[PDB]
């Protein structure tokens, strides 16, 4: 994995030794080269994972998350270079250093063979994200946002640490490859009940679980654009990755420990999607849509069938691309009208038609239009939850109504109707902005041609 | 009830608006032109009977039961003119009504495609920015203390001045752009 | 009662400015100043080259794989002769004639 | 389709509809004939005149605007403003 870790670290002298006019160009270029390099992780086998060393491995779960992570860094640099144009040069380099450091922590979060090293990289991701939100977020509430993001995580993750160390004392190892063969069944007891909660609640916070989700519509809203891109696209998926690894050790107790959380997710995706119908802040609407989409990934991981894991990893990759694009579109309107109020700037298709086409494609992927990988993940989770219980289709199908309703309402409010008369600073779309939208949307649509690389380890 | 200049509707205005609504709904009920023409003369005869009514309480009572008469006898789908609110072509062309300020954001290669148009646009912009301070100081020397009472704007009073707040009335888009 | 004289004067002045604005939307005869810039080609490029490409794809890549083009077997009647065998299908029994 | 309106055409059609009205004699009518002060018409007659203008040109004049059109020239100017004639 060290052929990816070392160039990601070499981005640090690359950004700190660059000429002052070259720090976006150089980091964008070489992060795109690292992202091109990331496709060598697609040496996956039908039986074995790609096991590099004692410290690092990559199966078909971690590989698309790695490719998406390494792809998101150039797009974050493109998204962030405009609103940091007037910034001090050293603070600009510190911002890029926090993004590079976050990429470095993420790529060895997903490839960590041993679970306590997964824990340390998983929690190490908090510090650059907290710094990016509280230092380069725009408003006052970022400070409060930085507290919620910090303290819902750690209150969930410090019982995980203890739990993992307990497994270290019980199994003798936290190697996931060893734990594939030495896993013992976890019977019904109170000790194993709180073992289950300590193993699961940190990832439940990261997803987020409904009812634990309150950090997200502050953290993703108050963040700068690169912060929101990495929070929605990658850091939510640390929870899903960690659940898919940790539920190996939690059988068969999961078969009744999942029942409350499944309810919290199945009703929660009804709630948060409904919340999106009455959001006045566009970026808050995109955040609540992320909570609603990750509720399906929670249900799919908890019912733990092959179809549900395939749907959940497809939905994680698809939601990463779609939610990152939606935050970038909302930012492209924020960088013109300087307000996140969705009803403010209307009729934007009359003024910005190609950006309206990007809004259309991102809305269509948000509502899971076939054959997008959004629909592939959505549909496969719906198949597996119908097999779990046939009544879930009600809460599934009603969700797909509301998901359509808030996706097009967002599209109707901002793009359609009459333009606002008094707003006259709607600049034509920059090449950087359309480029950012296309670098989200074109890989997302090309993955429909060959979705087997985003279907995870039990494709 | 809600008017830009007046604070209310007078009794005479309420009677005339009822008369126009009743004739339009009667034309919707009475599709054919001779049949509408007969019943419209009968409705005009009903309006001329209480025309010379001096008791305003009696006239207000007659207006109120005439509104109840209209509400019982209205058409469920009255005729709406196509560009009128509720019509089938209402606000259809608003997607084509691009505001004029977007021409400021054109590239010089596409402004050079229309040299005389933009040369004529720049003297409109020059006229507007030399008229602005005179029309602001016209508004503040003519508005009473406490703010304007009605939403009516004054005309230009001098020879050479433009009417205050004229630009978005004059440079509004066409109805068929 | 109609307009007040201030309303008449303001509408007259706005009318004159509006008609000047609408007159100024007409183009010049030189505008738009533009920069300086096979009878059955449709049946060749949109029909015949796609029939070539699709027949190549179906003949040498699709039908070389099993069960990709599965055709319903042809309907056999009494009295038919099979091309692959030559075996004449015998005709039906003689009808108990009805009319 | 949709032939363009001129000021002379709007004026001719407005005076045409008013000459086809039995409470107005067509020899006293001009473009500046006030309906109440020169032609001696009622306010109900003015409402009917505006409704005939609406039926003539195929669009609705609202009541806050219809109550102020008291001569043919004001009607012609209103239809001119709402249809953008002499572009």
């Amino acid at each position: 994995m060290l052929k990816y870790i070392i160039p990601t670290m070499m981005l640090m002298p690359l950004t700190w030794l660059s000429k002052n006019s070259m720090i976006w160009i150089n980091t964008t270029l070489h992060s795109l080269l690292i992202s091109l390099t990331s496709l060598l992780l697609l040496n996956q086998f039908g039986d074995n994972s790609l096991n590099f060393s004692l410290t690092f491995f990559s199966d078909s779960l971690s590989t698309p998350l790695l490719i998406l992570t390494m792809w998101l860094l150039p797009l974050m640099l493109m998204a962030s270079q405009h609103h940091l144009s007037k910034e001090n040069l050293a603070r600009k380099k510190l911002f890029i250093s926090m993004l590079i450091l976050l990429q470095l922590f993420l790529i060895m979060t997903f490839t960590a063979t041993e679970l306590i090293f997964f824990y340390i990289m998983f929690e190490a991701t908090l510090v650059p994200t907290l710094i990016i939100i509280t230092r380069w977020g725009n408003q006052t509430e970022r400070l409060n946002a930085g507290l919620y993001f910090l303290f819902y995580t750690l209150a969930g993750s410090l019982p995980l640490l203890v739990a993992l160390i307990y497994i270290q004392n019980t199994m003798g190892s936290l190697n996931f490859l060893i734990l594939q063969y030495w896993v013992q069944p976890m019977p019904n007891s109170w000790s194993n009940t709180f073992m289950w909660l300590a193993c699961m609640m940190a990832f439940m916070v990261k997803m987020p679980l409904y009812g634990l989700h309150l950090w997200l519509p502050k953290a993703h809203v108050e963040a700068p654009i690169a912060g929101s891109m990495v929070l929605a696209a990658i850091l939510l998926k640390l929870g899903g990755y960690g659940m898919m690894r940790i539920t190996l050790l939690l059988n068969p107790i999961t078969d009744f420990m999942a029942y409350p959380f499944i309810m919290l997710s199945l009703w929660g995706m009804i709630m948060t999607s409904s919340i999106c119908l009455r959001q006045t802040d566009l970026k808050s609407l995109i955040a609540y849509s992320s909570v609603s989409h990750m509720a399906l990934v929670i249900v799919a991981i908890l019912i733990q069938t092959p179809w549900s894991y395939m749907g959940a990893t497809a939905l994680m990759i698809a939601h990463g691309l779609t939610s990152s694009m939606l935050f970038c579109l909302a930012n492209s309107n924020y960088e013109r009208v300087h307000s996140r109020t969705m009803i403010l700037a209307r009729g934007l298709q009359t003024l910005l038609p190609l950006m309206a086409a990007w809004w259309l494609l991102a809305s269509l992927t948000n509502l899971a239009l076939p054959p997008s990988i959004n629909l592939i993940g959505e549909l496969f989770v719906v198949m597996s939850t119908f097999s779990w219980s046939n009544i879930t289709i009600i809460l599934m199908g009603l969700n797909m109504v509301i998901t359509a309703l808030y996706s097009l309402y967002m599209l109707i409010t901002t793009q359609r109707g009459k333009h606002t008369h008094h707003i006259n600073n709607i600049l034509p779309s920059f090449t950087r902005e359309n480029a950012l939208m296309s670098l989200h949307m074109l890989p997302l649509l090309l993955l429909s041609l060959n979705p087997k690389i985003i279907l995870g380890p039990l494709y | 009830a809600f008017l830009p200049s007046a604070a209310y509707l007078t009794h005479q205005q309420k009677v005339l608006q009822l008369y126009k609504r009743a004739l339009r709904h009667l034309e919707s009920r009475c599709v054919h032109r001779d049949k509408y023409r007969y019943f419209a003369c009968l409705l005009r005869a009903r309006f001329d009977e209480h025309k010379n009514e001096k008791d305003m309480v009696k006239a207000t009572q007659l207006l109120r039961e005439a509104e109840k008469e209209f509400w019982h006898g209205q058409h469920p789908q009255p005729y709406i003119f196509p560009e009128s609110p509720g019509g089938t072509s209402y606000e259809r062309y608003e997607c084509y009504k691009v505001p004029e300020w977007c021409l400021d954001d054109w590239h010089p290669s596409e402004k050079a495609m229309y040299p005389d148009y933009f040369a004529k646009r720049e003297q409109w912009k020059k006229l507007r920015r030399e008229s602005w301070e005179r029309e602001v100081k016209q508004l503040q020397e003519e508005t009473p203390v406490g703010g304007p009472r009605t939403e009516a704007l004054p005309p230009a009073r001098k020879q050479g001045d433009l009417p205050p707040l004229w630009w978005h009335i004059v440079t509004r888009p066409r109805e068929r752009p | 009662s109609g307009y007040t004289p201030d309303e008449k004067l303001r509408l007259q002045q706005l009318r004159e400015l509006r008609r000047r604005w609408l007159k100024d939307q007409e183009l010049s005869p030189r505008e738009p100043v533009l920069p300086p810039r096979r009878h059955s080609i449709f049946a060749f490029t949109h029909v015949l080259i796609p029939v070539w490409i699709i027949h190549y794809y179906l003949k040498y890549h699709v039908t070389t794989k099993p069960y990709t083009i599965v055709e319903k077997k042809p309907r056999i009647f009494p009295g038919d002769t099979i091309l692959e065998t030559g075996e004449v299908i015998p005709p039906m029994k003689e009808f108990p004639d009805q009319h | 389709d949709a032939p363009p309106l001129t000021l002379e055409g709007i004026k001719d059609r407005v005076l045409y509809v008013l000459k086809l009205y039995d409470k107005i004699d067509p020899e006293k009518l001009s473009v500046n004939s006030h309906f109440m002060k020169d032609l001696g018409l009622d306010s109900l007659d003015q409402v009917e005149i505006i409704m005939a203008m609406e039926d003539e040109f195929g669009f609705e004049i609202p009541d806050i605007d219809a109550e102020k059109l008291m001569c043919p020239q004001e009607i012609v100017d209103y239809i001119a403003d709402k249809k953008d004639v002499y572009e």
Binding site: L351, P353, P428 | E100, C102, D105, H107, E110, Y114 | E31 | -
Partner: peptide
């Protein structure tokens, strides 16, 4: 005759 300018946003970019 009587060609009118169509106001539209900038399609260059």
């Amino acid at each position: 005759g009587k060609r009118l300018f169509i106001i539209k946003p900038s399609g260059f970019y």
